Bilirubin oxidase
Amino acid sequence: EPFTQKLKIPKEIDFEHVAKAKFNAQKSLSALYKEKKTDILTFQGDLPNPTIRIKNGDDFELDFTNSLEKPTIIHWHGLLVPEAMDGHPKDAIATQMLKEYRYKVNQRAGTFWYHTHPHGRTGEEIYYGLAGLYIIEDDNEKALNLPSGEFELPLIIQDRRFDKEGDLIYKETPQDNNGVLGDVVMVNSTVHPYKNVKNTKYRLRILNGSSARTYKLAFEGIEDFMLIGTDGGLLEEPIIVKDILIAVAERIDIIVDFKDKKVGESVTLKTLGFKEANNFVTNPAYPDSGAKMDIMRFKVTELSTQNSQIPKKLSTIAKMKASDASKSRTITMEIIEGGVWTLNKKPYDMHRVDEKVKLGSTEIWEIKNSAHMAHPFHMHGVHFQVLERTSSIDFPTDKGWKDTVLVMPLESVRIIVKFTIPGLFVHHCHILEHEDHSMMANFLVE
Ligand SMILES: [Cu+2]
Ligand SMILES: [Cu+2]
Ligand SMILES: [Cu+2]
Ligand SMILES: [Cu+2]
């Protein structure tokens, strides 16, 4: 039943209305598909999990309780917080324990998210539900007067596999240790959804929260859309694009325009495929990285007089220079034998320091990849800029602040990063199955 069900909109935990929130990671049931209540994991009882929303400079406070069978912890993905609140895998809290998160937001507006991060089990916990979105606001962005209220939409894209009953299926074959691809696409935990829209501008806040699938998103119905932000918030100026690549854990802030749409018409969000991301052979039962897949439909149901007008200066981004760095280092992304995914040919030791870095310095990290697969590389505790790629695929998201960057097979991506927060952090591929099977490491800011 294509585009039968209405898109679910997450409740907001807005830190202008909430001083301290409560999350409790617990077993739940929802009918994601086939009217089958399937076992899921939630933070406050249902899916989608709530969108946190906070101004820069406000105090974030959240009491997290773990009612789950095994230890876990929440990582606030893209946030610049003290290591003790970052949700390092070594800080997982046991069943029936409490962690009190407290930090002062101190970073520019942008589109972030949050998920649990237990060592070896992150792919599973996110697959069964423990993720949501986090939005930081600031005065710059507010003064832009971008489409807001009913015209800003969170979109969490996750591909899934369901059985005949309607229950969820995670890993099935050995090839799935290389990444779980799915044949059903959910947005905001809704299978094949539809959104009733007006024929004006909509700001879409897009997170790829899948296990593995890299999406090449296009809208069949409109001619253009506008890239205005990445992981780290607004670009300097909009970029007109016809399609857009987004890997796991990456975030995009686009503007779409329905002004030429007649009532009764539709625009369909879909992925055009990206066969180049994967040179292994995926589980045959499920479509591969090149698959064309419909994702959701926006139904144009009402005419609108809204004239908002997207500014041409969005923000300023000081473009860091290669000479500003005082050290270069190389991270190799390979598969070593036994099918263990690694960085620098080492499996993750939770207790070992793989890179030691001076607090307040600027470094060039060169990320070199092997032939087998594209990898989304993420670092905690930092935002970085993309100095350069060697492959030729056009990545307009390079033009913005980033925390996760897609590294193509045999590509070298060379990023530049200033370390502002001390402590032990992790860097890793964010393909969840690879991270779970050891593609992870620690760096120490000192
Ligand atoms: Cu993450
Ligand atoms: Cu992270
Ligand atoms: Cu990977
Ligand atoms: Cu992480």
